[PDB]
Design a protein around this ligand. Sequence first.
Ligand SMILES: Nc1ncnc2c([C@@H]3O[C@H](CO)[C@@H](O)[C@H]3O)n[nH]c12
Ligand SMILES: Nc1ncnc2c([C@@H]3O[C@H](CO)[C@@H](O)[C@H]3O)n[nH]c12
Lengths: 237, 237, 237, 237, 237, 237
Amino acid sequence: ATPHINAEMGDFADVVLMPGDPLRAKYIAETFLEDAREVNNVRGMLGFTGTYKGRKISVMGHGMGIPSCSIYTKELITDFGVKKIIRVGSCGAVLPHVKLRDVVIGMGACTDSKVNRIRFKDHDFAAIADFDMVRNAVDAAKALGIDARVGNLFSADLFYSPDGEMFDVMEKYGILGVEMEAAGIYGVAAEFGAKALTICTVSDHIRTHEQTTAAERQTTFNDMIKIALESVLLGDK
Amino acid sequence: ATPHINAEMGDFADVVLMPGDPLRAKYIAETFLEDAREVNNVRGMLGFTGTYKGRKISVMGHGMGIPSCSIYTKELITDFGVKKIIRVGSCGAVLPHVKLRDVVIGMGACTDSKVNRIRFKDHDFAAIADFDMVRNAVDAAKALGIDARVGNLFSADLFYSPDGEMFDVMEKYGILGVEMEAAGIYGVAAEFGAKALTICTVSDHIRTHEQTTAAERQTTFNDMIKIALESVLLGDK
Amino acid sequence: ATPHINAEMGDFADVVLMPGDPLRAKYIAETFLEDAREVNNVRGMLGFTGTYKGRKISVMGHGMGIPSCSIYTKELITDFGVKKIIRVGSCGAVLPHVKLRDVVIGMGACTDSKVNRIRFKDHDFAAIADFDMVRNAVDAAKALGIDARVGNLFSADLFYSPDGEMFDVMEKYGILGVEMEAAGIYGVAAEFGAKALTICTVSDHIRTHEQTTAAERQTTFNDMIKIALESVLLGDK
Amino acid sequence: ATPHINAEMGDFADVVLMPGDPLRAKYIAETFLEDAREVNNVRGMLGFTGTYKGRKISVMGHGMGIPSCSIYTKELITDFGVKKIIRVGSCGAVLPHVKLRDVVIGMGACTDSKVNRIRFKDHDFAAIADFDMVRNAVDAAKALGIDARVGNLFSADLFYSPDGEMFDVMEKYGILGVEMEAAGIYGVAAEFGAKALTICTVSDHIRTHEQTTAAERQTTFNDMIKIALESVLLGDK
Amino acid sequence: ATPHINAEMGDFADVVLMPGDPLRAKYIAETFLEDAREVNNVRGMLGFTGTYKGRKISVMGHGMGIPSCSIYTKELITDFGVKKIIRVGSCGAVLPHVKLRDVVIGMGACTDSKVNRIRFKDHDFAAIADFDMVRNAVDAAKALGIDARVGNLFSADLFYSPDGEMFDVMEKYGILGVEMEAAGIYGVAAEFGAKALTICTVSDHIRTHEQTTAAERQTTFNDMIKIALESVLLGDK
Amino acid sequence: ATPHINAEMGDFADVVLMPGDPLRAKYIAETFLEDAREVNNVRGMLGFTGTYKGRKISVMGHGMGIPSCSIYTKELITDFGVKKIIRVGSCGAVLPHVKLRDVVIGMGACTDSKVNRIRFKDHDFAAIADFDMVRNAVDAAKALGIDARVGNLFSADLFYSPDGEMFDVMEKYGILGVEMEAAGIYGVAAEFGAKALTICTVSDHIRTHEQTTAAERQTTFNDMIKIALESVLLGDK
Ligand SMILES: Nc1ncnc2c([C@@H]3O[C@H](CO)[C@@H](O)[C@H]3O)n[nH]c12
Ligand SMILES: Nc1ncnc2c([C@@H]3O[C@H](CO)[C@@H](O)[C@H]3O)n[nH]c12
């Protein structure tokens, strides 16, 4: 066990799906997993292990922001034998053609956090995913007839940024989605020698006003979950 | 009424105590508050409002890391009329005679996060508590006959630093406690015009490797809560 | 002696008042201290030692800027047994309610200097005062019937900044007064194990353009001196 | 024509392979392209256009270093209708399991250059390749019976670094290969709205200075060119 | 032989003139050097050695940008006994009163590269020329009737820079010319114990001014080469 | 008049010699100047005006450190029509071959200060002296049978370095001497359009046991003053 996960080596599958919201981890375990068992509840950061089409799969919230998710992913990797991490989150969009409910696959993650410069002697560490995992998610998405873009995300430290112009810079450089985790998870993966992938669904268009019914947000969340789970199976071959 | 807090104006007291552990926030509500009612449960980040010795007080989790607490503290200040935030957290000690369960008060907070540099044109912003809140906490702790050292905290982005030597630097500069939120909450306090104070209980020693349990962090750090709660009463004068 | 102070251990009190202007030190010694003797004149940086109401007390100029005061504060601490340093200075205001000749107490000090980053492996060190010293100053002013605000100062390297926009940021984040030394003295204090506090008298307003003369700065900011000297007696318990 | 390219629109294919060495571009043109024609010789930086399995393809040197390749790739993109750039180079390995003659595909490229911080408001831009081009080069390599590793390159400004310790940092976060261009190219691609990819063969292992005979270097160089070309054809469909 | 120069000790004079363009190096050899012979052609980077008025001189292109010339200049100093490097190039002007075909001598070289910060522990290294070489060039030019401007160059990493506003900053601080190598060469000079100088002719004006008019000098490219060669002769005396 | 100088336009010559120590300025005026008159004493920063060999010359202290001297040089340039500033001080030698007697002329000045980065958009400004003043000083020195050394100074913010990591680095890149002002004055000069020079005598030399009797140090200090004063007369031609 660790100070943030009341569990032991074995309670987790070698692949963990991670939404920000612990309750979405509960929903995911209750809906797409068989024989789900709750394996962590320290700080209410719910985690579950079960099976998807006969493959052992875990799912556990990471909380919001680079520091939070850095703790959980690091601990999972070094203390619970985890090999792959798939974050299933939401993101804000800055591109004109990226619409709500669109799926995005962070091949890379830009960030305004210092965590990677701390790791990397103040140089530019390109926080990227594991390629096979990105390929798996792309191929799974196709098999499900879901459209996804593969590119850069931007993991932000401040949800409420005093730096509004930055969004114009993100758009200029083709950032597909703005969330709060990817660059930190990718930094942990590189530091501790595991593989990670971030998939998001666009839940709001920054500098725009339009919404979606609760029914649509769910199906879209389900689609993300399905892309994620199915890509694991492709990953296993 | 806000993106991470499903509550309405009035649901929160004008003062909110905030551990990072939403479950500590539950314990505190159940143990120190009367007539407490749950006022938030979004993302399992439990918030409660009740009374202490007659005074309306709220307690709510803020999650781990600067990005996580920046969100909740921003939203309480700008949208729930919150005037005071008292962070009540845990911390790692670096000094040889700061021991387990010592209470320390963050008058200022160092950080390796970039959020204040971002706010402050890449210069050094001294992240500090409201003085009067510090004085209320000092006088409250004296009346209870609980020791409390006042000084600098260090708000870390990485619980697991790659840079072991930073700890030696923190020690050299008299850092009383290593945690993950203080400098962040102080940034939001200054930015949106509120008052903040961080009080922490030492939950592990980075050198002797003494540490507490998750169960102990969640429910046995009560000196700091008495201090925070009595300090609010001194504030009302 | 030390390279910038021609005196011996014992010549200074354990508490040393330090304005930037040595001529102000002279005025303070001749006006507030009994039986004052000059104890330094290296580089014209006059330092004196007298008694204040029976308490042995020193006052000495520290020059303009962080590099200047960092030299004197270091030398006093390591070679003259000085335990407390109270900088008594002048500062420019940016806040609309802050008037000329207002006394401000620097609990914290922001800076655009690189010295603390040099100290703190390029992270954010919160340059803070000693708490008790702050509290003493607060209580001493209350006893004297002198108003004083406690909070953040900004320690500037460039008195004539090309970045006029930085004042707008200082104001937004509640900076009480702009000077050139506080963050550097707090840095030295932390590095060498002593305690410091900066009290300033507002000598010009950056927005209203209202100003005082050199001669007024040199001798007429006496509120802060009474507060400083009386706070020392309080600190003696 | 452009300042550094004396040719006209039409003279380049929409895809340009780019080795650092202009002489190797001539070699690629003579070895792989039918009816190759020289289309640039400004600054001796040879560019050629021909056909490969009936497909118009170009090859041009980009010189050494980020600022150099940035110049050429930019002009190609804005004035020659070039949609894809494939850098083909050699790289140094820092990982022990990464052997001489391995093909390394840079899905992302780290760097100690400031060019991208300049572009991205001093934040971390994750310099990445176009995903499809990565996947094409992977599929092409497989059909050729070759296993290419996909991950991060490090793009160095200094071939002769004063700081040998940086290599251990690169090793610790999984850098596959060390070159001097990729991150700059990825930077240009995102700024001006085109697609890039860098493929390298490992020529030396930086730690033990262990290297390879010209015969095996010519061989693996050709395999790299074969992969790059076959990648374009997969991309076309 | 070095990894970028196929020659042997002796093949190069102890003074090397360097243009960006290898073809320019070719032009210089045939125009000014008697008994000119080619000593390198690796990567088409033409180098030559002949005599100018019986003085053994070499001329060799350095390629474009700080990383490219840093390679060549390092290898020349460390393995070929080169003592002096004289960069001869073109530069753009940002000041109104600097006119076309003015000759600018870089006694200093500002930069937006990170190479010197990497060398200098992230501080400000002032990348400067050798003082004797500067005066030799001033004196050489005066003898020819040209008033060379002595001051700062700016070594840009991006010929196509995203930040136009920086040019206003360059104008404000008196930068004489904008090229791409000088700071890097001055960096190498200092690191490896050699002497360097960059001389440039003003070949255009950067950006449109309602105050830029000045005039035009008759100063040819050939004139700049004369100044450089003659300045070597002065240095020998 | 300004807040740091109680004088009026006309009270200063258009050239000002500036030691750090104001008593030294008094010494300089009394020794080399005819009809020396005190023109400033605000903050005891003694400034004097008189003539040397019929030529109007002023001399005034600038205090210790970049921030102090920046205030005075700016004010002299923008308010007293000063055109040339010659710093006359001392420095420590890091290079073995730079003896404890030598005159060093700072053609450029490195620094660990942030003041130029604040001026130059966080890039590298090469803080340089005006060339002609450099040449005037070399000639004044030569005529007095003194061989000045021309090169880089290092301008330190921290006389008492926390770790002293930079001394070996200064030695590696050829820094002639260490003081605390040069880079700052040069930046003011660049910023406000005047001309500066720093001259220093080597007052301490690391790693040896070199001895000087005061007959040798007074001769050498006077030597520096003559060099500076004679350099002005040369510049007047
Ligand atoms: N040694 C340590 N280092 C960093 N953070 C913490 C904490 C607090 O607990 C959380 C991470 O464990 C986070 O909220 C932080 O503030 N306790 N002990 C700590
Ligand atoms: N508007 C202003 N900005 C910066 N510093 C000061 C001061 C202080 O006074 C001195 C310069 O006037 C120096 O010590 C500085 O800290 N007064 N007014 C100021």
